[PDB]
């Protein structure tokens, strides 16, 4: 309620207004054509979301009351998932149109070489998300539940589960206020998201192998820290 408002407000301040959208690099028709620039663009797009998602997380009531080590672990473990979740909701998959948190708009083919096949998987997940017609308050709860979740190595796992439970209840109550089957279809997108993001890890592995350009240190640390072997 006040929780709901704070979550909505955190979501809306974490991304571009309709009027801040930048179409100046956008190409409707992409010409017949990975090189270093594609790989650089991929890392730049990921990296443009680090600070934004950290600041968003800091506005979730209770998140700053988790241990700093648990805060960092949750952000790192959820970063790719959150990047994709927010991108999927923001983008317009019926146009092949990717909308990043800076407002930058790009057509599928302008990214695809950096992203690899993963971009198609992301657009498929975005089309599925869009069909659900998730309203902003439900999305703002769900994003929080992507982040505030069990992860191996947490210092205070019960406190994480308690804040999770608060956000879950807030969502449940909101979905009842608007209208269990709707709830479960919303929650079901979280595992699909995780699985989707395995392909993200696979893509980074591939790019680190190829090594046309190395990942930036912060992305590299996320990648390394989230490999459970």
């Amino acid at each position: 309620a006040n929780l709901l408002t704070s979550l909505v407000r955190a979501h809306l301040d974490s991304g571009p207004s309709t009027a801040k959208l930048d179409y100046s690099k956008f190409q409707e028709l992409v010409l017949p054509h990975e090189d270093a620039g594609d790989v650089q663009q991929f890392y730049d797009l990921l990296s443009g979301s680090l600070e934004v998602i950290r600041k968003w997380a800091e506005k979730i009531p209770g998140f700053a009351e988790l241990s700093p080590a648990d805060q960092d672990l949750l952000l790192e473990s959820a970063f790719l998932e959150l990047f994709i979740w927010r991108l999927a909701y923001r983008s317009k998959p019926g146009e092949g149109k990717l909308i990043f948190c800076s407002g930058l708009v790009l057509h599928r083919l302008q990214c695809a070489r950096g992203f690899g096949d993963w971009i198609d998987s992301i657009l498929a997940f975005s089309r599925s998300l869009h069909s659900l017609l998730v309203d902003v308050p439900a999305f703002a709860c769900l994003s929080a539940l992507v982040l505030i979740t069990d992860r191996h190595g947490l210092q205070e796992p019960r406190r994480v589960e308690e804040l999770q439970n608060r956000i879950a209840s807030c969502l449940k109550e909101h979905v009842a206020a608007v209208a269990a089957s709707c709830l479960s279809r919303l929650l079901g997108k979280l595992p699909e998201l995780r699985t989707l993001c395995t392909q993200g890890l696979q893509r980074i592995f591939y790019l680190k192998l190829e090594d046309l350009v190395p990942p930036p240190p912060i992305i590299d640390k996320i990648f390394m820290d989230t490999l459970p072997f």
Side-chain angles (χ1 to χ4, degrees), residues 185-199:
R185 290 249 291 290
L186 289 178
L187 259 17
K189 288 284 160 211
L190 305 185
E192 288 167 14
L193 184 61
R194 261 272 163 109
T195 310
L196 229 203
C197 290
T198 304
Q199 300 179 42

PDB file of all heavy atoms in Angstrom, residues 185-199:
ATOM      1  N   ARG A 185       0.113 -16.806 -12.825  1.00  0.00           N
ATOM      2  CA  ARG A 185       0.670 -16.528 -14.161  1.00  0.00           C
ATOM      3  C   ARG A 185       1.714 -15.421 -14.070  1.00  0.00           C
ATOM      4  O   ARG A 185       2.653 -15.363 -14.849  1.00  0.00           O
ATOM      5  CB  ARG A 185      -0.392 -16.085 -15.190  1.00  0.00           C
ATOM      6  CG  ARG A 185      -1.367 -17.170 -15.649  1.00  0.00           C
ATOM      7  CD  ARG A 185      -1.178 -17.594 -17.096  1.00  0.00           C
ATOM      8  NE  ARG A 185      -1.553 -16.587 -18.089  1.00  0.00           N
ATOM      9  CZ  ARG A 185      -2.801 -16.188 -18.347  1.00  0.00           C
ATOM     10  NH1 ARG A 185      -3.831 -16.668 -17.657  1.00  0.00           N
ATOM     11  NH2 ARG A 185      -3.031 -15.298 -19.312  1.00  0.00           N
ATOM     12  N   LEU A 186       1.535 -14.533 -13.117  1.00  0.00           N
ATOM     13  CA  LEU A 186       2.505 -13.472 -12.916  1.00  0.00           C
ATOM     14  C   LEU A 186       3.822 -14.050 -12.294  1.00  0.00           C
ATOM     15  O   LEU A 186       4.931 -13.811 -12.807  1.00  0.00           O
ATOM     16  CB  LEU A 186       1.853 -12.409 -12.055  1.00  0.00           C
ATOM     17  CG  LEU A 186       0.748 -11.578 -12.730  1.00  0.00           C
ATOM     18  CD1 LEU A 186       0.209 -10.632 -11.695  1.00  0.00           C
ATOM     19  CD2 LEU A 186       1.378 -10.873 -13.918  1.00  0.00           C
ATOM     20  N   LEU A 187       3.662 -14.837 -11.228  1.00  0.00           N
ATOM     21  CA  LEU A 187       4.767 -15.450 -10.538  1.00  0.00           C
ATOM     22  C   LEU A 187       5.563 -16.405 -11.422  1.00  0.00           C
ATOM     23  O   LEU A 187       6.781 -16.513 -11.291  1.00  0.00           O
ATOM     24  CB  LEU A 187       4.258 -16.176  -9.318  1.00  0.00           C
ATOM     25  CG  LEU A 187       4.405 -15.518  -7.933  1.00  0.00           C
ATOM     26  CD1 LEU A 187       4.698 -14.031  -7.918  1.00  0.00           C
ATOM     27  CD2 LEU A 187       3.228 -15.887  -7.029  1.00  0.00           C
ATOM     28  N   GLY A 188       4.866 -17.074 -12.330  1.00  0.00           N
ATOM     29  CA  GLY A 188       5.453 -18.032 -13.255  1.00  0.00           C
ATOM     30  C   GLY A 188       6.454 -17.409 -14.226  1.00  0.00           C
ATOM     31  O   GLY A 188       7.346 -18.089 -14.773  1.00  0.00           O
ATOM     32  N   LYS A 189       6.321 -16.126 -14.471  1.00  0.00           N
ATOM     33  CA  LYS A 189       7.355 -15.482 -15.261  1.00  0.00           C
ATOM     34  C   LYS A 189       8.739 -15.440 -14.554  1.00  0.00           C
ATOM     35  O   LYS A 189       9.718 -15.180 -15.235  1.00  0.00           O
ATOM     36  CB  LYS A 189       6.912 -14.068 -15.624  1.00  0.00           C
ATOM     37  CG  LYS A 189       5.816 -14.081 -16.665  1.00  0.00           C
ATOM     38  CD  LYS A 189       6.373 -14.394 -18.059  1.00  0.00           C
ATOM     39  CE  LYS A 189       5.296 -14.889 -19.003  1.00  0.00           C
ATOM     40  NZ  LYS A 189       5.813 -15.832 -20.008  1.00  0.00           N
ATOM     41  N   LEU A 190       8.830 -15.562 -13.227  1.00  0.00           N
ATOM     42  CA  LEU A 190      10.139 -15.435 -12.549  1.00  0.00           C
ATOM     43  C   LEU A 190      11.126 -16.584 -12.938  1.00  0.00           C
ATOM     44  O   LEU A 190      12.239 -16.316 -13.351  1.00  0.00           O
ATOM     45  CB  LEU A 190       9.965 -15.295 -11.043  1.00  0.00           C
ATOM     46  CG  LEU A 190       9.077 -14.173 -10.496  1.00  0.00           C
ATOM     47  CD1 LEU A 190       9.128 -14.123  -8.983  1.00  0.00           C
ATOM     48  CD2 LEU A 190       9.409 -12.808 -11.063  1.00  0.00           C
ATOM     49  N   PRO A 191      10.713 -17.881 -12.815  1.00  0.00           N
ATOM     50  CA  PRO A 191      11.540 -19.006 -13.298  1.00  0.00           C
ATOM     51  C   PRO A 191      11.854 -18.966 -14.756  1.00  0.00           C
ATOM     52  O   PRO A 191      12.927 -19.313 -15.165  1.00  0.00           O
ATOM     53  CB  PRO A 191      10.670 -20.258 -13.016  1.00  0.00           C
ATOM     54  CG  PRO A 191       9.704 -19.823 -12.013  1.00  0.00           C
ATOM     55  CD  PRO A 191       9.482 -18.342 -12.173  1.00  0.00           C
ATOM     56  N   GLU A 192      10.896 -18.590 -15.576  1.00  0.00           N
ATOM     57  CA  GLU A 192      11.212 -18.443 -16.984  1.00  0.00           C
ATOM     58  C   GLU A 192      12.310 -17.406 -17.193  1.00  0.00           C
ATOM     59  O   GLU A 192      13.187 -17.632 -17.980  1.00  0.00           O
ATOM     60  CB  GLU A 192       9.986 -18.035 -17.819  1.00  0.00           C
ATOM     61  CG  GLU A 192       8.955 -19.129 -18.008  1.00  0.00           C
ATOM     62  CD  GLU A 192       7.649 -18.570 -18.565  1.00  0.00           C
ATOM     63  OE1 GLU A 192       7.658 -17.386 -19.055  1.00  0.00           O
ATOM     64  OE2 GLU A 192       6.634 -19.299 -18.445  1.00  0.00           O
ATOM     65  N   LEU A 193      12.272 -16.316 -16.441  1.00  0.00           N
ATOM     66  CA  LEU A 193      13.302 -15.294 -16.492  1.00  0.00           C
ATOM     67  C   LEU A 193      14.683 -15.856 -16.170  1.00  0.00           C
ATOM     68  O   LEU A 193      15.666 -15.588 -16.881  1.00  0.00           O
ATOM     69  CB  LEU A 193      12.950 -14.103 -15.560  1.00  0.00           C
ATOM     70  CG  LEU A 193      13.913 -12.885 -15.584  1.00  0.00           C
ATOM     71  CD1 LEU A 193      14.066 -12.163 -16.943  1.00  0.00           C
ATOM     72  CD2 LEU A 193      13.432 -11.888 -14.518  1.00  0.00           C
ATOM     73  N   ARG A 194      14.762 -16.623 -15.075  1.00  0.00           N
ATOM     74  CA  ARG A 194      16.027 -17.204 -14.656  1.00  0.00           C
ATOM     75  C   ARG A 194      16.650 -18.048 -15.726  1.00  0.00           C
ATOM     76  O   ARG A 194      17.828 -17.925 -16.046  1.00  0.00           O
ATOM     77  CB  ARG A 194      15.760 -18.231 -13.579  1.00  0.00           C
ATOM     78  CG  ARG A 194      15.949 -17.882 -12.188  1.00  0.00           C
ATOM     79  CD  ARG A 194      17.334 -18.064 -11.597  1.00  0.00           C
ATOM     80  NE  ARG A 194      17.018 -17.202 -10.447  1.00  0.00           N
ATOM     81  CZ  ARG A 194      16.839 -17.583  -9.212  1.00  0.00           C
ATOM     82  NH1 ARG A 194      17.111 -18.832  -8.843  1.00  0.00           N
ATOM     83  NH2 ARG A 194      16.477 -16.670  -8.310  1.00  0.00           N
ATOM     84  N   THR A 195      15.864 -19.024 -16.190  1.00  0.00           N
ATOM     85  CA  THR A 195      16.249 -19.845 -17.315  1.00  0.00           C
ATOM     86  C   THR A 195      16.654 -19.013 -18.517  1.00  0.00           C
ATOM     87  O   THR A 195      17.617 -19.309 -19.146  1.00  0.00           O
ATOM     88  CB  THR A 195      15.068 -20.759 -17.727  1.00  0.00           C
ATOM     89  OG1 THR A 195      14.595 -21.391 -16.545  1.00  0.00           O
ATOM     90  CG2 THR A 195      15.496 -21.814 -18.722  1.00  0.00           C
ATOM     91  N   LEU A 196      15.942 -17.950 -18.833  1.00  0.00           N
ATOM     92  CA  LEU A 196      16.319 -17.132 -19.970  1.00  0.00           C
ATOM     93  C   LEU A 196      17.706 -16.620 -19.763  1.00  0.00           C
ATOM     94  O   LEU A 196      18.477 -16.532 -20.697  1.00  0.00           O
ATOM     95  CB  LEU A 196      15.482 -15.868 -20.079  1.00  0.00           C
ATOM     96  CG  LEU A 196      14.829 -15.448 -21.375  1.00  0.00           C
ATOM     97  CD1 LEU A 196      14.559 -13.948 -21.347  1.00  0.00           C
ATOM     98  CD2 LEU A 196      15.596 -15.810 -22.634  1.00  0.00           C
ATOM     99  N   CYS A 197      17.997 -16.208 -18.535  1.00  0.00           N
ATOM    100  CA  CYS A 197      19.286 -15.583 -18.260  1.00  0.00           C
ATOM    101  C   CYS A 197      20.506 -16.492 -18.191  1.00  0.00           C
ATOM    102  O   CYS A 197      21.653 -16.031 -18.337  1.00  0.00           O
ATOM    103  CB  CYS A 197      19.138 -14.663 -17.058  1.00  0.00           C
ATOM    104  SG  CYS A 197      18.121 -13.214 -17.537  1.00  0.00           S
ATOM    105  N   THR A 198      20.268 -17.806 -18.098  1.00  0.00           N
ATOM    106  CA  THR A 198      21.314 -18.759 -18.338  1.00  0.00           C
ATOM    107  C   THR A 198      21.961 -18.540 -19.712  1.00  0.00           C
ATOM    108  O   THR A 198      23.191 -18.644 -19.875  1.00  0.00           O
ATOM    109  CB  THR A 198      20.752 -20.172 -18.242  1.00  0.00           C
ATOM    110  OG1 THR A 198      20.153 -20.301 -16.974  1.00  0.00           O
ATOM    111  CG2 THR A 198      21.866 -21.208 -18.432  1.00  0.00           C
ATOM    112  N   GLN A 199      21.136 -18.250 -20.703  1.00  0.00           N
ATOM    113  CA  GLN A 199      21.670 -17.950 -22.059  1.00  0.00           C
ATOM    114  C   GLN A 199      22.545 -16.733 -22.068  1.00  0.00           C
ATOM    115  O   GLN A 199      23.483 -16.680 -22.851  1.00  0.00           O
ATOM    116  CB  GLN A 199      20.586 -17.753 -23.101  1.00  0.00           C
ATOM    117  CG  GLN A 199      19.673 -18.928 -23.317  1.00  0.00           C
ATOM    118  CD  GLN A 199      18.579 -18.627 -24.377  1.00  0.00           C
ATOM    119  OE1 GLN A 199      18.822 -18.016 -25.453  1.00  0.00           O
ATOM    120  NE2 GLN A 199      17.390 -19.064 -24.069  1.00  0.00           N
TER     121      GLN A 199
END
